[PDB]
Amino acid sequence: MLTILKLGGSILSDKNVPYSIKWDNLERIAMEIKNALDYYKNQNKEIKLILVHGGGAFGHPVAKKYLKIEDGKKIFINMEKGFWEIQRAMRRFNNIIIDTLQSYDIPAVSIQPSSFVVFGDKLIFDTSAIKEMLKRNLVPVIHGDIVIDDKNGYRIISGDDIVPYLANELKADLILYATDVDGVLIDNKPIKRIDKNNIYKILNYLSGMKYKIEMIRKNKCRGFVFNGNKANNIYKALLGEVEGTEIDF
Amino acid sequence: MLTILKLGGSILSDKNVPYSIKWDNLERIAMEIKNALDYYKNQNKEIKLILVHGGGAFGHPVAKKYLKIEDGKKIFINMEKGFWEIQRAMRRFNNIIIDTLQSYDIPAVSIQPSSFVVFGDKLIFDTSAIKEMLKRNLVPVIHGDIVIDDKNGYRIISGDDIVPYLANELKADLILYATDVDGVLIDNKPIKRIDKNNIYKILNYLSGSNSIDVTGGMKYKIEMIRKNKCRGFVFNGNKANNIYKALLGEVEGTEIDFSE
Numbered sequence: 172m173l174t175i176l177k178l179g180g181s182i183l184s185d186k187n188v189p190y191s192i193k194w195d196n197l198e199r200i201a202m203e204i205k206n207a208l209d210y211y212k213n214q215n216k217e218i219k220l221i222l223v224h225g226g227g228a229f230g231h232p233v234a235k236k237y238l239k240i241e242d243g244k245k246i247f248i249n250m251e252k253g254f255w256e257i258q259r260a261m262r263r264f265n266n267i268i269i270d271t272l273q274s275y276d277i278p279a280v281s282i283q284p285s286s287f288v289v290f291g292d293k294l295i296f297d298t299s300a301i302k303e304m305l306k307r308n309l310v311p312v313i314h315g316d317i318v319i320d321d322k323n324g325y326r327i328i329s330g331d332d333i334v335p336y337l338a339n340e341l342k343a344d345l346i347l348y349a350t351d352v353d354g355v356l357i358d359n360k361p362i363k364r365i366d367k368n369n370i371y372k373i374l375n376y377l378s379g380m381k382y383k384i385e386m387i388r389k390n391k392c393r394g395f396v397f398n399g400n401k402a403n404n405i406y407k408a409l410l411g412e413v414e415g416t417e418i419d420f
Numbered sequence: 421m422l423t424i425l426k427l428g429g430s431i432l433s434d435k436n437v438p439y440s441i442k443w444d445n446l447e448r449i450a451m452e453i454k455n456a457l458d459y460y461k462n463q464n465k466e467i468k469l470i471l472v473h474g475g476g477a478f479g480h481p482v483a484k485k486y487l488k489i490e491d492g493k494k495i496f497i498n499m500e501k502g503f504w505e506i507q508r509a510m511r512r513f514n515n516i517i518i519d520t521l522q523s524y525d526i527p528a529v530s531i532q533p534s535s536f537v538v539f540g541d542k543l544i545f546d547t548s549a550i551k552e553m554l555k556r557n558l559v560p561v562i563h564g565d566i567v568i569d570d571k572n573g574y575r576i577i578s579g580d581d582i583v584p585y586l587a588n589e590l591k592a593d594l595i596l597y598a599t600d601v602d603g604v605l606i607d608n609k610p611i612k613r614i615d616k617n618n619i620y621k622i623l624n625y626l627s628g629s630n631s632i633d634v635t636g637g638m639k640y641k642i643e644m645i646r647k648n649k650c651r652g653f654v655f656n657g658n659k660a661n662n663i664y665k666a667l668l669g670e671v672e673g674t675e676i677d678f679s680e
């Protein structure tokens with residue numbers, strides 16, 4: 172029923188180019204998601220879908236402006252100005268993505284964490300609204316954002332924080348990570364799987380693909396890391412599976 | 421003391437001209453909010469301020485396209501386009517308002533109800549982040565928005581729904597209603613004070629046939645203030661300095677006192 176597809180940095184926007192958008196790729200990714208949803212409408216299978224994207228060439232660039240290094244500590248400053256300016260950037264990127272999805276008749280809607288989510292100790296993140304939206308078969312689109320931290324004051328929640336959380340909070344049947352690599356690379360090769368056995372030797376090797384791997388296990392989750400730039404991977408990924416690294420916890 | 425300023429009326433936008441923006445009026449208002457914030461710093465007084473605005477010529481016009489009357493009632497349709505459409509329009513208005521407020525160094529941030537609020541017999545509306553934001557001297561700007569309900573449907577949440585709710589949740593001290601009128605008009609004249617010695621006497625008149633507001637607007641504002649045993653002002657937000665004065669607690673319009 173429920174799937175969480177993450178569109179990770181750099182398939183949507185080049186990081187080394189502030190305010191950049193990879194239009195064709197975005198246009199294609201949106202199409203494959205549509206063709207996927209359609210496929211299921213025939214099989215008459217109810218498939219609830221959530222979407223997550225990063226800060227790409229929007230979130231980061233603007234943030235970097237209010238992050239100062241001091242005593243080896245990432246420090247936000249001038250947040251009187253920084254909070255809005257980061258919000259604003261993520262709002263642009265979020266509109267662009269949602270409009271495109273909408274143009275393919277994907278019933279996407281904006282989820283803006285900065286408005287309600289709180290980091291620190293526990294993760295305060297009321298999924299009430301999201302559950303309802305899913306009951307309507309709407310497709311909530313969540314994005315990395317600036318967010319309050321009741322301990323550190325400010326902090327940047329990312330997709331890696333959001334996906335795992337929601338998958339557990341919402342009991343997701345299938346979680347997908349679209350990236351620019353053919354999966355988790357070991358010695359420059361994508362392992363077909365990651366469980367409870369070879370993991371130990373994997374955490375050492377990696378000593379945020381790690382962060383990602385740990386965040387999902389910390390939730391007995393289970394997801395696929397694949398390449399989003401390969402025409403059809405997303406469409407395949409959603410339908411059942413294609414090539415990529417599997418992570419089961 | 422925490423204050424809630426409700427922009428409202430048609431002081432920011434002319435509902436008649438779709439996507440209308442009363443720039444001049446919107447800019448002056450930012451000044452005044454600024455003048456006020458600077459004033460509370462000089463007099464060294466702690467103020468937490470929340471702003472709320474409605475849909476103006478943005479929310480309503482778009483929303484109406486997805487509203488139908490069915491069996492003597494309202495129902496949203498095609499919300500697979502409608503929800504985003506209304507979000508989109510509101511997000512624009514919110515941007516314009518916040519960008520401006522910022523252009524006067526007012527630390528405004530965006531609160532988008534559509535993302536987390538559920539409209540039930542009781543609102544589901546986590547105010548954790550807002551509290552932290554106020555804690556850090558940010559100015560949270562909430563706006564009317566589309567939202568899902570807990571009954572297979574959708575609902576429009578307005579400033580009217582948002583203000584009272586927050587007044588309660590956050591235990592506000594002062595409620596400010598910037599409107600298109602000088603106050604609660606009684607004989608085309610803003611009554612100075614409303615309290616537990618005339619409220620009912622006032623409600624009844626508001627309900628009569630010689631009342632200027634038959635939309636039940638003022639009545640609702642009065643009752644929530646009274647319900648939040650706090651204090652509020654109803655004033656003209658189109659007049660120079662009323663918003664500045666109001667924020668200080670001295671705007672000449674109509675006072676509503678039920679604190680203590």
Ligand SMILES: C=C(C)CCOP(=O)(O)O
Pocket residue numbers: 180224225226227229230231234257261314315316317327328329330331
């Ligand atoms: C940079 C911001 C605001 C969020 C970054 O998170 P990502 O989407 O994981 O890159």
Ligand SMILES: C=C(C)CCOP(=O)(O)O
Pocket residue numbers: 473474475476478479480481483506510564565566576577578579580
């Ligand atoms: C029309 C929408 C989106 C809500 C408008 O809220 P209000 O103008 O405060 O009633």
